[PDB]
Amino acid sequence: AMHPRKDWYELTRATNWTPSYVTEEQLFPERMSGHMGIPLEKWESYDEPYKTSYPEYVSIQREKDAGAYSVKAALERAKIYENSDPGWISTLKSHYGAIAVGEYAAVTGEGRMARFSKAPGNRNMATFGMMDELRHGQLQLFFPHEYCKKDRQFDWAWRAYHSNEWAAIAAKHFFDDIITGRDAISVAIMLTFSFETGFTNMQFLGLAADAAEAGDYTFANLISSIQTDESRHAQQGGPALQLLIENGKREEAQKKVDMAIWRAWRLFAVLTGPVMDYYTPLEDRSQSFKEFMYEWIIGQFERSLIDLGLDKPWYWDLFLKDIDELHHSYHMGVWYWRTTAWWNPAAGVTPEERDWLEEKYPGWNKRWGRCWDVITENVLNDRMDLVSPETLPSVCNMSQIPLVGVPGDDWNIEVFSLEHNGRLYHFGSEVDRWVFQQDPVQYQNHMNIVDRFLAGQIQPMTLEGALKYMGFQSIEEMGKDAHDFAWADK
Amino acid sequence: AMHPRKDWYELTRATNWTPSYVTEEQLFPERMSGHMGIPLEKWESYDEPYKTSYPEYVSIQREKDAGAYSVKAALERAKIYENSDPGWISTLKSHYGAIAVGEYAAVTGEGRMARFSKAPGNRNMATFGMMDELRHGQLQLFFPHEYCKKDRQFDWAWRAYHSNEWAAIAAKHFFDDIITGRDAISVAIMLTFSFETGFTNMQFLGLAADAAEAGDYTFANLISSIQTDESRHAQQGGPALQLLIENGKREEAQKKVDMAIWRAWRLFAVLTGPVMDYYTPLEDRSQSFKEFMYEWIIGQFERSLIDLGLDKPWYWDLFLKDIDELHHSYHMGVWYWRTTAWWNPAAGVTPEERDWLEEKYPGWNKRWGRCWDVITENVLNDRMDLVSPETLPSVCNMSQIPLVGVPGDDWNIEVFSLEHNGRLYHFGSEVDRWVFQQDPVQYQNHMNIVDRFLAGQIQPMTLEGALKYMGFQSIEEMGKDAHDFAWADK
Amino acid sequence: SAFPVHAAFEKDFLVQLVVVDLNDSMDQVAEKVAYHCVNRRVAPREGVMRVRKHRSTELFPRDMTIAESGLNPTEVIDVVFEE
Amino acid sequence: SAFPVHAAFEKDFLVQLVVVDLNDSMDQVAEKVAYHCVNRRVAPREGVMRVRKHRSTELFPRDMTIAESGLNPTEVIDVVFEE
Amino acid sequence: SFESKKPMRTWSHLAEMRKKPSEYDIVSRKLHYSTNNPDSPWELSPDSPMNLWYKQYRNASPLKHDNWDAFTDPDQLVYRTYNLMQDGQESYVQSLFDQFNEREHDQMVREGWEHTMARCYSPLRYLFHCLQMSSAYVQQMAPASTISNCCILQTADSLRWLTHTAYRTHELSLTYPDAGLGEHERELWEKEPGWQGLRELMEKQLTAFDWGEAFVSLNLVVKPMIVESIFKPLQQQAWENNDTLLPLLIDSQLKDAERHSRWSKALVKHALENPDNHAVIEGWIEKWRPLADRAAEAYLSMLSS
Amino acid sequence: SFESKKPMRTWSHLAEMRKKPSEYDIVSRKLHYSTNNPDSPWELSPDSPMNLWYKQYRNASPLKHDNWDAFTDPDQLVYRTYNLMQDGQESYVQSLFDQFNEREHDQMVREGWEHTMARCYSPLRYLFHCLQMSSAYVQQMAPASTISNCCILQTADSLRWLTHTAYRTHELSLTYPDAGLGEHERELWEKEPGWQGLRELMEKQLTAFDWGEAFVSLNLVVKPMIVESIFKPLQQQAWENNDTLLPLLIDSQLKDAERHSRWSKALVKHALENPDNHAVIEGWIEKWRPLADRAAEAYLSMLSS
Amino acid sequence: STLADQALHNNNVGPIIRAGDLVEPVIETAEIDNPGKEITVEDRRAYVRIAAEGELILTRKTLEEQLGRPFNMQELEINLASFAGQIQADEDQIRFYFDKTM
Amino acid sequence: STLADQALHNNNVGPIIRAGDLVEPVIETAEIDNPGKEITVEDRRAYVRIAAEGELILTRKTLEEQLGRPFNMQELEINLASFAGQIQADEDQIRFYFDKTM
C-alpha cells in the first residue's frame, strides 16, 4: 500500500532549523532574502495552496510534454508558416523573441527563492518553479527552431536577449528588475504574484484564443500547457503576501505589488497590445486587447488582489485610461520604426479594421486615425520616404519604450521628468517616475538606448549606426510592413 | 546491466514440444491449424522478421496511443465537422463504419494463430497481433464516438457490423472468409500477407494523404499510427509462405494468395475507390485511386510477392483492366442507391471534376459521363424522381456488391454464372466465380441480400422493406447526396 | 405469375432485378426494364428494344412470351437495340 | 553647437529626439521638428508654428534663439500653432 | 414507416444507460456480431466448417445466459489503460533485473540453487506458453466482447510471464553455464516426472473446445492451482536459498494472476444469474480438479527433492 | 553597410558546428545574457545591489575560463529527458515502497533498527535540503547556462532524496510509533553530536558565495563525502539489520549522486583547460576537506554506536 | 470607471480549462457538484472560463465519472490553465473560493 | 500493361515514414548510411516514401545523430507506417532489401 500525500507532506517542508555556526542573517542575508527582519519562526506558517511532490511532478510533467511535442510533430505539414497571414507569423516572431530566454531567466528568480527564502514551503515550491521555467525556456527555443531555416528573424528566439535591440532592452530592464535583480521575497511578490497571476494570462491564454481562431493549434496548445505550470508556481506569492501583512509589512508589500503591476503593464502594452488589435487578423480577434484586459486583469486579477487583503493600486484611474489609449500609440511607434524590430509589424488599418477599432474604442478614428490617414495617403501616392523615420523616438527612463500620447483631434501628450543626482530623466507616466523614486539605486545610473546615443556610445551616431548597435546582422532581419503594404489596396 | 534481446529471444519462442497425452493432430487439428500435414519439427524454422518482446511492446504502444489521443484532444475545436466538405465527412462515416468492428474481428484471426499455429514464433507474434487489433478496434470506436451527438450516421461506427445493410454484408462476407472463418495458416496467408501487406495501405496511408490535404490531422495521424502496427504483425505471413513453399505446398499457398487479393480488391474498389476519386474534394486528391493502386499494390505489394518466390496472379491482366473501370461503376451504384448507405455519397461530377477524371482516366466522359449526363440533366430540371431507384441492383454471390460493367459509348457488361447443387449463382467476374469453386462448402448455402429478397426473407418485399431489413432506425440515417445537389449549380 | 429476372440495359452501368410476368411479350419485358434505365442513366433513342439471353447472339421474338422462351427465373437477360 | 532636444509636435502621437543648433531661432527649431512630423503623421495646416517648454503656458518668441531661451540640452519642448 | 429521431449522446445500444458511458463501455461492449444469427455465426454458408465449429462449441455450450454481453470486467481495462498499468509494472521488473544484476545477485544464491532453477523454474516457459495458447482460445470462442477482452489481456500476461522466464533462464546461465539452463527445458517438460502431471493437464485442457469448459478448466481450476502450488512454493524455496529476486518477480506475476482470478469470478457471478449454471460450472470443476491436483503433487515432489 | 545573408539551419551561435545541432544544443546553450556586459550583468544601474553581487561573486571568481559556455553536460540532459529518466527511476522506487509495505518489511527489521533509523536516517531530510538550497545557489551564480542546467536538475534530485526520506520516516513511524520518527529530527539536527559536523559544514558551505568556491565545496567535497561516509555505510548497516528496502532505495539515490559527480568532473576538466585553475580548485578542496572529514567522522561514530 | 467598477465587483470563481478532453467533463462536474449554483461558461476556443458565485467545487469522484476513465485529482493540472478564486486542493477535490464578498 | 509492367519491375526498397519528427532525420540517415546510392523521396504529406535500389540501411547511430536525441532502434516503429523490401532489423540497424533483381 501507499500512504496519501496529506500524511507525509509536512515532513517534506519541515526543513527550517536554528543556525549555530553562522548567524541567521549570514545564512539569509537581507539583500538576497528580503525577509524584512521577520524571524525564521514566523515563516514556518507559510502554506503553499497549490502543492505538488517529486514523484507526482516528474510523472505529470512527462505527460504534459508528451502532448506538447506530439501535437507539434503531427502538425508540421499544416503549412502554418506558408499559409498564415504574415501578421500572425510576426506574432510568433515577437512572442518567441520576447519570451523564450526571459523564461530561462525566470529559473534564476525561482532559484533565488529556493536558496534564500526563509519559508520552507516556498523553497520547495520554488524548486519545482526552477524546473517549470527550465521547461518553458526549452520549449520556446525548441518550437521556433525549425523556422530558422525559413526566416532569419526566428533566430531572435535565441538572439533577442543577447542584443541591444530596444524592445529587448525593455524586456530585460523589466525582467532583471522583477525576476533576477531583487531579493527572494521581492521575487515572490513581483514575479509570482504580480506578473504570473496577473499579466501572463494575457500572453499565454488571451493570445492562445486568437491562435486557435487563426488555426495555429501547435502554438495555442503549447502556450496553454505552459500556463498550467504558471498557475501552480505563481501560487507562491499569495502566502508570502499574507505573511507580510500579518507581520506588519502591509505597506511594503503593497508598494511592491503596485510597482510590479505597472511595470508589467507597460511592457505588455507594447508586446501584446499590437498583437491583439492589429497583427492578429481581424477575423481571428477573439476579443479586443481592452476586453481581454477587463477579463484577465480587472475581473480576475484585481479581484484576487482584493480578496487577499490588498488595496487597488493608487494609480487605478490612470491605469484604466491607459488601457483605452497606450497600446494604440505603442503600435503606431513600433510600426513607424518597424525597421528597428525583429518582426514585421502589420499596420492593421484597412477600412474594415478601422470600423472594428472604432467599435472597440469609440473615437479612435478622430485620434490615431488622423495619423493613419496621413500614412495611408502617402502609401497610396508612393511617397514611401515619408513612411520611414529619420530620427529616434524619445524613450522612457523606466519602461525603455518610446514616450507617447493621444494624437489627432484632442491631442494630449505628457512627459514626467525628474532631476536626480545631477542628471535629467524622462518618464512616460506619473507611475513610471514614482517607480524610479521607490528605489533610485536600482535605476539611477542606467542609460536607456537614446541616452547612449547622445553620450557617443553608438557609432556612427545615425539610425543605421543604431540598427547595427541593436545587433541586426543582415538586412533580412530588420522589420518591414507585414504585408509589403498590400493593405493600401483596400 | 541488461542483456540484449538477441541473446534471449530464442528462448521466448522455444515452446514447441512433442505431445504424449493427446496426439499432435488432436492438439493442432487441421481444420483449425491448416498445417497441411507438415510435421511440428518443420515449423520450428519459422523466423518472424519483424520482432518485438513484451517489455518493448507495452512501452512503445503506450507512446503510440499517447500521441494519437493528444492530437485528437488538441484538435477538438478545429471545426472539422462543421467546416469540412460534406464529402469528407462521408468519408469518415464510411471508414469508421466499414472498419472499426472488423478490426475487432481481426483479433480473432490473430487468436486463431496464437492457439493453432504450429510455428512458435507465429504464436507469439499473433499474441501481439491480438493486442494490436484490439487497439485498432478501440481507437476506431473511440474517435468517432464524439460525433454521435452531431449525426446519427456516426452510430454506424458501432452498428454497421450488427446490420444487414448491403455494404456491411459485403464487409462481413470478406472478413469472415479471410479472418474469422478459416484455419490458422490460411489466416497467416490471406489476412497478414495478402490483405495487411497489400491492401490496407490504400485505406490507412493513401487515404491519410488525402486527409492531410483536407486538413484533418486527427484522422490522418490516427490511421497512419494504426498502420505502424499493421506493418509489424503483417510480417507473420511471409515466413509462413516461405515455409509452405519449402515443404512442397507452393500451389496451395499461391491459390490462397490469389483468392485473398481478389476478394480484397473488390471490397476496396467499393469503399476506397469512390472516396479517393469522388468524395474527397478535388483539391485534396493527392493522387487518383488508380495512381495509388499502382504505387501500393503494383509497385510495392506485387513486387514483394515476387521477391518471396510467388508468381503474379493468373488474373493479372483482368486485374489491371478492373483498376481502370470497376470503381467508377461501384461509385455510380453507391450514389444512385445512396439511400441504402449509412454515409452521404458525393456525386463528384462538376465540370472541374469531370476534367480531372478525364485526365486520370482517358475516355471517362464517353463512358460513365454518359450516365452522369442524364443524371445531371434531371437534377437541373428538378426531375428528382429519376435520380432515385425503384428496384434493387443484382448482386454478386461472392463479393456481395452489385453487378456492373462499362456504360456509355462502348458498353460492355458481363455476369459470370454457375449452376451448382441445384442452384443458380451469379458472379461479377471470372475470378469471383473461380474463388467460389476453390471452396464451395464455404459459400454454397450463403444467400446474398437479393437472394433473401426473392426468397421472402425481407418483408415487405419492397425497397422500403429492404431499407428496414438493413437496420436503418430513422430517416436521418439513410444516405443522401452529400451536398444536397448543390453541385448541379456548377 | 411474377417472374424475376436480372436485366442489363444497353449503355447502362449495371444489372438490375426486374420482375416481369410469365405471360409478358418480349416487347413488354423490354419496356419494364427500360423503366428503370432510360431517362435515369441512359439517354432515350429511336429504335426497337429487343430481349436476348445475357451475351447471346440470338434475339427472342418480340411477340414471344417469357413462358414460351424457356427462360428460367433469375436468369440474366440483356435489353438491346436492333443493329 | 549641436543641441539635442526632445520635441512633441501638435497632433502627433509621440516625443522625438530632434537635434537643433545653439543659435537657432524658435522659427528654425519649429521647422526642424516639423520635418519629422508634418506629412508623416500630422496633416499640414495654415498658421505660425511656435515653440514652448513642455506643457508651458508661455511661448518663446519667434526670433529668440535656443541659446537665449535658457533651455538646457535634452529638455522637452512642444511645437504648437498659435490659437 | 420511417420515423425521425435525434442524435444520441452515445452508441444506440448504450443510450438507455442511466450513467454517462465510460471509455470502457464505448470501446468494449457488444462487438461480437457473430452471436447475432444463431444459424450462421459468420457471414458464410451456414454449414461452413467454422460456422459448424462455433454452433457446436460456443452456441451449444451447456453454460448459458440470455445476456452474456452484460458482463463487465471489474477492472474495466481497455488497451490504453492496460499498457499504462503494465508499462508501470514491467518497467519496475526490468529495473529489478538491472539492479540485481549490478549487485551480482545470482552469484550469492545458496549452493545448488541453479540446479533447482534449471529443473523447476526454467521449464515454466512451456507451462506459461500453454496458458498463453489456452487464453487465446477462450478469447476467440467467448460469447461476449467484454469476456474476450479479459482473455486478450490474459493472453498477453501469459506471454509476459513466458518472457520473464526466458530472460532469467538466459541470465542465470551466464553465472551458471554448467546446469543446462536454456538447453534442457524441452527434455524436462517432455520426460521429467515432476512436469508430467502439468503436461498431461495442459495437453488435455487445450483440447477442451467448448468455450464454457475451456474457461472453467483454465481460469477456475488450472490457473488457481498454479498460484497455490507453483508460484507461492517457489517464493518459499527462493527465500530458503537466498534468492531475493525471484520472490519480487513472482509478486509482480501474482498481481496479474489475481487480476485474472478477479474477472473470472465476476464472470461466474454473471453466469450464476442463471440457476442452471451452478451445476454446469461445478461439474466441470469436479471433472478437472483431479488432473490439477495430480499436476501440483508431482511438481511439488520435484521441487522439494 | 548591411549585407544580405541566407537563413541558417540552426541558431546563429551554433551555425558553425560541424555536426547537426542536438536537442540539447538547441535548448541549453549560451542562455545567460547576464555574462555579456562585464560592467552590468543585469539591465539595471551598473551599481545596483544584484549587479554588485554578480560582479563580485561570479565575474571576479578566481576560477576563470574564456569560454565557460562551451561546457557540456556529459549526459546531455534536457528537461524532457530528465523527466523520462526520473519518472522511470521514481516509479520504480514508488513500486518498491508499495510492494515492501505489502510484505510488511518494516516489521521484520532487527530489534532496535527503528531507533538507528530515527537517529541516523530521518534527520537526513535536513542535510538533503541543505544540498537542495546549495545546488540552487550554484545554479543562479554559474557563468554558463549548461552549467546552471546541471545544477537545476541536481536541485530537483536533492528534493527527490528529501522526499524519499520524508515518506519513509512517516511510513516507519506507523510500525514504530514510539521512536520519535517524524517528531524529533530538528532536535537531532540541532543538538546531536553526530549531526553537528554535518550541520557546521553545511551552514558554512551555504555562506560561500563565490560561484567557483560554491561549486567546488558542494560538488567536489561535500557530495562525494556523503556518498562515501553516509550512503554506503547506511547500506552496510541496513544489511546487518535485515533492512532490505533501504539498500535498494540508496542504490537509486546513488545513481543520481554519480550523475552529479559525472557532470562535476566534466566541469573540472573544462576548467583545467586553464592551467591557473588547478591551484584554485586544489586550494578550495584543501580548504574544505577538514570540515568534510570531521563531518563524516562524527556521523559514522553516531551510526556505529 | 462604471465598466471597470462592475468588472471588479464580481465574486466569480472557478477553473479555466484549456482546449482538450477535460473541457466538457469539468463543465458537467461543476454542474453536478454545485447543485443550486448557476454555472457560467465562456468559451474562447483555446480555453473555457467556468464560474460560479463565491465557491465552486470539483470532486475527483464526479470528474472521474464525467471523464469516463480513471482519474487522480493531481492530474487536473495537465489542463487547468488558470483559475479565478483562491484554491484549496486535496486528493478528493479542488475548491475555488473567495474570502470576501464584493 | 506497359505502365503496369514498368511499375512492377522496380527494385525500390526503403521506409515509409508517417508525418512527424522522424521524416527529415530518416531521409538524412538514408543518405548518410547508403553512400553511393541515390535516395529518392516522394512526399505525400501524411507520409514520405523513401527508397534506394536493392538495399537501404538505417543505422541506429546515424538516426540518433540526425534525430538529435537518444534513440533505440525499436522506436522506429512509432513512425514506420510501411516499407518496401524485405526487412532485417536488430538493435544496431534496420535493413530493407530484395533477394531478387527485377
Ligand SMILES: Cc1ccc(O)cc1
Ligand atoms: C518572460 C517570462 C518569464 C517568466 C515566465 O514564467 C513567463 C514569461
Ligand SMILES: Cc1ccc(O)cc1
Ligand atoms: C477491416 C480490418 C481488419 C483488420 C485490420 O488490421 C484492418 C482492417
Ligand SMILES: [Fe+3]
Ligand atoms: Fe514560465
Ligand SMILES: [Fe+3]
Ligand atoms: Fe512562471
Ligand SMILES: [Fe+3]
Ligand atoms: Fe488493424
Ligand SMILES: [Fe+3]
Ligand atoms: Fe492488422
